[PDB]
């Protein structure tokens, strides 16, 4: 009744509120809302830390620019949030941590702009690398933090055997992992088609083979954003519009407290 719509939403977590007047409904990955570890599925015996509103809230990452040449962007979770306020502190002070996420991708333009972004949430997003060398991508390179990583139109093998770059080389039509992009739609996803919507909203459960795990050693979800259809505007052959990613941890809980983990990121 009154005037409610699929397109107009308000999301509120902690002291953060998002409004959107042009959404295309919202996805709940695998039909599962985030929930806490139940006693009959519990494994670490120690009383957990549940930081609630201080960590379960909307952290906005650094904005990226979408242009005619952009091949795609990718992020890993929890890694993208490792430095985000009290969530980051809790993550590094505890051996174990589990958390679900609300993912909100933002990209507005105009009635005369054109293009379509595929937004995918992938469980265990294992990416391919640089070299002849198998499974060689270094920790610091596998983990870009907030910055994220990028996609490529083709595979350039890291040639310098003497001092190997040890990076990922994710080719766009192979979803950076040896499969075809068109089938990535079997993963929880939405599409931001500029004529249709400003944003994407995907709610993610904790997905893993275990009830809880090391957040520093292992990423649970990967967020891959690719231009399914390239950006275009009027005749201006150098158009550029912003894409902003905002993420909230949900039902976050931590186990195994001790001194802080300080990973070497250099």
């Amino acid at each position: 009744a009154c005037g409610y719509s699929d397109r107009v939403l308000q999301l509120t977590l902690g002291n953060s509120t998002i409004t959107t007047q042009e959404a295309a409904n919202s996805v709940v990955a695998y039909g599962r809302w985030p929930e806490f570890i139940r006693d009959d599925e519990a494994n670490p015996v120690d009383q957990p830390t549940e930081p609630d509103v201080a960590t379960c809230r909307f952290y906005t990452l650094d904005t990226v620019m979408w242009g005619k040449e952009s091949k795609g962007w990718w992020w890993k979770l929890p890694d993208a949030l490792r430095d985000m306020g009290l969530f980051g502190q809790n993550m590094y002070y505890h051996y174990l941590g589990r958390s679900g996420y609300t993912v909100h991708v933002q990209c507005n333009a105009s009635k005369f702009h054109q293009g379509a972004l595929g937004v995918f949430a992938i469980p265990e997003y294992c990416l391919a690398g640089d070299s002849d060398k198998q499974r060689y991508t270094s920790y610091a390179n596998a983990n870009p933090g907030e910055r994220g990583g990028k996609f490529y139109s083709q595979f350039n093998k890291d040639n310098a055997v003497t001092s190997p770059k040890r990076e990922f080389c994710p080719v766009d039509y192979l979803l950076g992992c040896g499969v075809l992009l068109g089938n990535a739609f079997v993963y929880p996803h939405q599409i931001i088609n500029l004529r249709t919507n400003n944003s994407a909203t995907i709610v993610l459960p904790y997905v893993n083979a275990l009830a809880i795990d090391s957040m520093v050693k292992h990423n649970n979800w990967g967020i891959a954003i690719l231009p399914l259809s390239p950006l275009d505007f009027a005749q201006d052959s150098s158009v550029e519009i912003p894409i902003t990613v905002t993420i909230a941890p949900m039902c976050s809980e931590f186990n195994g407290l001790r001194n802080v983990t300080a990973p070497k990121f250099q």
Partner: protein, 62 residues
């Protein structure tokens, strides 16, 4: 003709409801002191003067 009312007690001694007594000594109501017990009202006539007042969780423009 004594008038009796309850004071709103702010700071309390280490000693409940406390009262005060009022008596009007004059025939003209103008001569009277102020009761100061006053009723409050809705901001609505100022904050929402709409013909069709709409509910806050719905679109203002529909």
């Amino acid at each position: 003709g004594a008038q009796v009312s309850s004071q709103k007690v702010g700071a309390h001694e280490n000693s409940s409801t406390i009262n005060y007594t009022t008596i009007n000594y004059y025939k003209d109501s103008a001569s009277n002191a102020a009761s100061k017990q006053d009723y409050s009202q809705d901001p609505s006539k100022f904050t929402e003067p709409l013909k069709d007042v709409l509910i806050k969780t719905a679109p203002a423009l529909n």
